Structure 1
Amino acid sequence: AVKYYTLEEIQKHNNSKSTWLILHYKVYDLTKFLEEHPGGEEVLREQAGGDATENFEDVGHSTDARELSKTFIIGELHPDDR
């Protein structure tokens, strides 16, 4: 099965308690990763609640970084919002 979230609900996860973002139509919960991110917290909080695919690819993350990202996936963007 697969959980689908709308842009409207993802948008609400941009506070001190929860940080979600979209990358290639998948939704990631990065709340507990903020302090471990080599690129810092600041760059993640700025994109919280929205689609950060371009910024993510613009920095050109390594293969290991991408393999690690999969552990934070909690669902996908609802087909209707794509």
Structure 2
Amino acid sequence: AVKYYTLEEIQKHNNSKSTWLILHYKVYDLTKFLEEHPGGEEVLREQAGGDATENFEDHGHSTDARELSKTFIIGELHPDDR
């Protein structure tokens, strides 16, 4: 089964309590990863609540980084918002 979230729901997760973002139509909860992120937390907080695909790809992440990201996926962007 797959859980779908709308852009409306996602934008609400951009506070000290929760940090969600979208990458290639998948929704990632990075709340607990902010402080472990090699690239820093500021770069992640600035994209919170929205689609950060271009920025993610812009910094060209390694295979290990991409494999690790999967553990934070909690769902996908609703087809109607794509």
Q: Post-superposition shift, 1:76? A: 0.1
Q: Post-superposition shift, 1:5? A: 0.1
Q: Post-superposition shift, 1:67? A: 0.1
Amino-acid identity (%) = 99
Partner in structure 2 of residue 62 of structure 1: 62
SS at match of 1:31: coil
SS at match of 2:70: helix
Q: Post-superposition shift, 1:79? A: 0.1
Taking structure 2 as the reference length, the TM-score comes to 1.00
Q: Post-superposition shift, 1:32? A: 0.0
Partner in structure 2 of residue 78 of structure 1: 78
Taking structure 1 as the reference length, the TM-score comes to 1.00
Query: Where does structure 2 lack aligned partners over 5 or more consecutive residues?
Result: none
Separation in structure 2 between the aligned mates of residue 11 and residue 31 of structure 1, nearest angstrom: 14
Alignment of 1:14-53 (within 5 A): 14-53=14-53
Q: Post-superposition shift, 1:81? A: 0.1
Query: Where does structure 1 lack aligned partners over 5 or more consecutive residues?
Result: none
RMSD over aligned CA atoms reads 0.1
Between the two proteins, the alignment pairs up a number of residues equal to 82
